Amino acid sequence: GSRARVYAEVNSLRSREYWDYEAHVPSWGNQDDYQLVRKLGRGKYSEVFEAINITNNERVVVKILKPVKKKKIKREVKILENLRGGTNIIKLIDTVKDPVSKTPALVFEYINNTDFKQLYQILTDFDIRFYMYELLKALDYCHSKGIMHRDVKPHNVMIDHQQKKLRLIDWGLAEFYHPAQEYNVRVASRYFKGPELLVDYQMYDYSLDMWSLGCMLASMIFRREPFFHGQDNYDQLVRIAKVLGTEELYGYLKKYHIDLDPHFNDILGQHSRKRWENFIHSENRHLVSPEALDLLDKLLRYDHQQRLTAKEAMEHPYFYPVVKEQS
Ligand SMILES: O=C(CCCCCCCNc1nc2cc(C(=O)O)ccc2c2cnccc12)NO
């Protein structure tokens, strides 16, 4: 079938307890130590509040989990435990429960983020290189720990643009990678779904996250956010094929023995592969360089096996100015 080019066997080389999250027994502390200040957001399975730890006055966030998704709670908890101390990964401070209802919650460090819709409009060339390099550190770390994030998107990449801090958040869709395992393709936000998800190819790997990061890179350097703006999952693949080309799509499908949903017959059309330079104009030209386009071209590929790994991306010349500054 398909296997990851890096870190393919890393979970099988670790103790079973590392990846067998259904067997994980979290230590649940007392949520009563936290005073909720403000609701920050709400999703299908969780709500996040700004909070104060009343025993030490530290500001934190509390993510209250819709209880009874028990397996999924253990998964997120175990993944965060395994990622402890990872570079640019949101820090899990504690796992707590309401001591009466037993509803679980996760306590994270607080990041004073700048909303990406405002931020992306003011980023310089160097800013984009810097933040993408920092994001790559988090992905390389989690992939090396055997974990796919599966929901990389601007809302999950919190950036404090004053302190220059970046954290990859919301590990609720993340999974452990096991060679030959078939995964649910209902992951990621529509605009950040890799072609593999859109064509129902279940034997995917860490390279899914590299598609999503390529989409974010394109949106930043070209100032089109989101970059591929589908109206539904079918239209999402059409938007991708209008840039990457249809002949190239068909070669990918043939290589992996993938059959397209026949509804695509009515909507895909015929599209040449476009030059990345076609997206340059006066409003984004200062953010685009030959190195940026070369990197992007090596991320936004149909063939998940040919996309750069996070490490190879970090090694690309596009980041040399950042490396030089960090030394
Ligand atoms: O794209 C950006 C803007 C992002 C838009 C803000 C989303 C609002 C939710 N707000 C927070 N959600 C968290 C979720 C988790 C988790 O689920 O793991 C962990 C930590 C936080 C968090 C920490 N500090 C402040 C706010 C939040 N770039 O800045």
Q: Quick one: 79 and 189 in the same domain?
A: no
Q: Quick one: 35 and 74 in the same domain?
A: yes
Whether the CB of 114 sits within 6 Å of ligand 1: yes
Whether the CB of 110 sits within 6 Å of ligand 1: yes
Give me the phi and psi of 17, to 5 degrees please.
-60, -25
Q: Quick one: 154 and 244 in the same domain?
A: yes
Q: Quick one: 31 and 127 in the same domain?
A: no
Largest separation between any pair of C-alpha atoms in the chain: 63
The total number of structural domains in the chain stands at: 2
Q: Of the residues 44, 113, 152, 156, which should be mutated to test ligand 1's pocket, given the most ligand atoms within 8 Å of the CB?
A: 113
The answer to whether 41 is annotated as binding is yes
CATH of the domain at 306: 1.10.510.10
Give me the phi and psi of 104, to 5 degrees please.
-90, 155
CATH of the domain at 92: 3.30.200.20
Burial letters 98-135, b for 16+ CB under 10 A, else e = eeeeeebbbbbebbebeebeebbeebebebbbbbbbbb
Q: Quick one: 212 and 86 in the same domain?
A: no
Distance from residue 158's CA to the centre of ligand 1 (Å): 6
Cβ-based neighbour number of residue 13 at 10 Å: 9
Atom 10 of ligand 1, residue of closest alpha carbon: 40
Distance from residue 147's CA to the centre of ligand 1 (Å): 20
β-bridge pairing 157-160 and 147-148: unpaired
Contacts of 181 (CB under 8 A, 6+ apart): 203
Q: Tell me which method was used to determine the 3D structure.
A: X-ray
Structural domain harbouring 36: 20-110
Pairwise CA distance, residues 34 & 216, whole Å:
34
Show which of 110, 139, 154 is a domain's final residue.
Answer: 110
Show which of 53, 76, 110 is a domain's final residue.
Answer: 110
